[PDB]
Amino acid sequence: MDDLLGLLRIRIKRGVNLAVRDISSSDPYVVVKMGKQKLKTRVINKDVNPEWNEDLTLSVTDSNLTVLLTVYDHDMFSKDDKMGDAEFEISPYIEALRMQLDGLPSGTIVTTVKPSRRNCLAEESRVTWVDGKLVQDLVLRLRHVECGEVEAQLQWIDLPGSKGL
Amino acid sequence: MDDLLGLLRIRIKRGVNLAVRDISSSDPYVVVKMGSQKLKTRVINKDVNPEWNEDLTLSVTDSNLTVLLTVYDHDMFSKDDKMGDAEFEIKPYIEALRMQLDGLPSGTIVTTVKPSRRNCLAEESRVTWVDGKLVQDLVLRLRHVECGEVEAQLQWIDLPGSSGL
Ligand SMILES: C[N+](C)(C)CCOP(=O)(O)O
Ligand SMILES: C[N+](C)(C)CCOP(=O)(O)O
Ligand SMILES: [Ca+2]
Ligand SMILES: [Ca+2]
Ligand SMILES: [Ca+2]
Ligand SMILES: [Ca+2]
């Protein structure tokens, strides 16, 4: 689409020990923001360990963009409460995507991003080459909230027509 | 593009009782085609009941287009052998994708395509609203071969941009 390098697939896997925002539980959904783009998972009802396993799909024009991720507690007839947020860099994953990864076996670890004061990794993050595809695993520790983390996996979808990688 | 309705995610699940094309077995892969777009799954060795569990993501510009599908047996030092062909319409899926289905319980069946003499359905194919997504499960009986069917699921991907539906 005349800048599009392709499509970043953010597999939102699960939230672990998310914060309580209705008495006893929460109705968490995730909002992803990058540039003008804004994607949301479904609400999962009354579960602070929600298993979304939901794919959000963004278009990439910048190899060097931030993905902001925010969790909210859905309240149907009132205001939704904040449940924390994180952000992560996609540049390490895009750099790795232009790397000629043929030949390397399944399970080849190609880049490692480490937890820093300034990033939201709870663990170090593995850009792993597996089954012919380049995948990055993320455990994001949410900011600005008393507990919780979200597990995600980045994957990549090529778009025929676009500017390419 | 600008012309894009969205992306059809075709999940190739597995093959069942596929035909033998190496003396005693086969190394089958699935190839898919819509318009000028062609995609294939990876090869499974020596298995006439392969579990592919692989996505093939196509660009949809034409609601009324048809997906062609074939299975071939990979031969390392020869022309690959035929294992059958099928095809299916995306129109009933796309039209139902337009429906406003929130509030409906996960598991609601929304349309049912019947098997007919002229289509390749082994079973009536249902379009179901599950986990906040419209999905269509297909069992495709392979043509021009002595046995085999392919199980697949249709999912839709909407792109930020796009004509959309
Ligand atoms: C694995 N693959 C199907 C994607 C490529 C190889 O297939 P082929 O070499 O048998 O044609
Ligand atoms: C089967 N064949 C080798 C003759 C053609 C298959 O090639 P492809 O369309 O799977 O890339
Ligand atoms: Ca609340
Ligand atoms: Ca709530
Ligand atoms: Ca053969
Ligand atoms: Ca063979």
UniProtKB/Swiss-Prot annotation, chains A, B:
SMART domains: C2. GO terms for biological process: abscisic acid-activated signaling pathway; defense response; positive regulation of abscisic acid-activated signaling pathway; positive regulation of defense response to bacterium; positive regulation of response to salt stress; response to salt stress. Changing residue 75 to A: Impaired Ca(2+)-dependent phospholipids binding and reduced abscisic acid (ABA) sensitivity, as well as altered membrane localization and PYR1 binding. Residues 1-106 form the C2 domain. The keyword Cytoplasm applies. Ca(2+) 2 binds at residues 22, 27, 73-75. Ca(2+) 1 binds at residues 21-22, 73, 75, 81. GO terms for cellular component: cytosol; nucleus; plasma membrane. Its cofactor is Ca(2+). One of its GO terms (molecular function) is lipid binding. Disruption phenotype: When associated with disruption in CAR1, CAR5 and CAR9 genes, reduced sensitivity to abscisic acid (ABA) during seedling establishment and root growth regulation. Keywords: Abscisic acid signaling pathway, Calcium, Cell membrane, Cytoplasm, GTPase activation, Lipid-binding, Membrane, Metal-binding, Nucleus, Plant defense. The keyword Acetylation does not apply. InterPro entries: C2_dom, C2_domain_sf, CAR1-11. Mediates the transient calcium-dependent interaction of PYR/PYL/RCAR abscisic acid (ABA) receptors with the plasma membrane and thus regulates ABA sensitivity. Stimulates the GTPase/ATPase activities of YchF1, and regulates its subcellular localization. Promotes tolerance towards salinity stress by limiting the accumulation of reactive oxygen species (ROS). Promotes resistance to bacterial pathogens (e.g. Xanthomonas oryzae pv. oryzae and P.syringae pv. tomato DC3000). Belongs to the plant CAR protein family. Dimers and oligomers. Binds to PYR/PYL/RCAR abscisic acid intracellular receptors in an ABA-independent manner, both at the plasma membrane and in the nucleus. Interacts directly with PYR1, PYL1, PYL4, PYL6 and PYL8. Binds phospholipids in a Ca(2+)-dependent manner. Interacts with YchF1. This is Protein C2-DOMAIN ABA-RELATED 4. The gene is CAR4.
